[model samples]
Target: EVKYPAIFRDEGTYWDVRFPDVPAAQTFGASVQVAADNAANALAIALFEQSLPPASDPQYWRLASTEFVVWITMADVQFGPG
Candidate 1:
């Protein structure tokens, strides 16, 4: 299982999700739960397409005080090799 850290930012009406490890894998939702779900889906798609960026340390991310970390796993994802 590949684990990557995600950062979530609150943008008033919605939340934006960003994966520090995979910068191209980004998504947003109306709520935190929705944002998390979107993040997972985005990450999965990125993995399937082999378009993921180089991962970096979680601490290296310039997150705001309100932003938090969530680990997204690519374990249960199933996709054919491209």
Candidate 2:
């Protein structure tokens, strides 16, 4: 698989993560590490057992809608030949 740097502006909250690659479709994490772990676990279970959409999917994205501000930390994560 190829890797690319992407800036994600969290729909809600002031958390913006610069991911080397897109996170899992159903990746969920709390603002804090422990809370994020719990949230991600619950999300994974709900999707797996209920056949729900992944968190990063458009459907899930809508559900997770919130305010956020994403800043560009590093700009060298692109994979394209620009």
Please name the candidate that would achieve the greatest lDDT relative to the true structure: 1
Question: Can you write out model 1's per-residue Cα lDDT over 33-71, one digit (the tens) per residue?
Answer: 988888888888778747556566787677797798878
Residue 21 lDDT (model 2): 24
In model 2, the clashing pairs are 11-66, 11-67, 12-66, 12-67, 26-55, 30-36
State the lDDT at 52 in candidate 1. 50
Model 2 residue 28 CA deviation (Å) reads 12
Give the Cα-based TM-score of candidate 2 against the true structure: 0.27
The lDDT of each candidate is 0.80, 0.32
User: Model 1: runs farther than 4 Å from truth?
Assistant: 49-55, 75-82
lDDT of 2: 0.32
Per-prediction TM-score to the true structure, in the order listed: 0.75, 0.27
Instruction: Count residue pairs with overlapping backbones in model 1.
Output: 0
lDDT of 1 at 68: 84
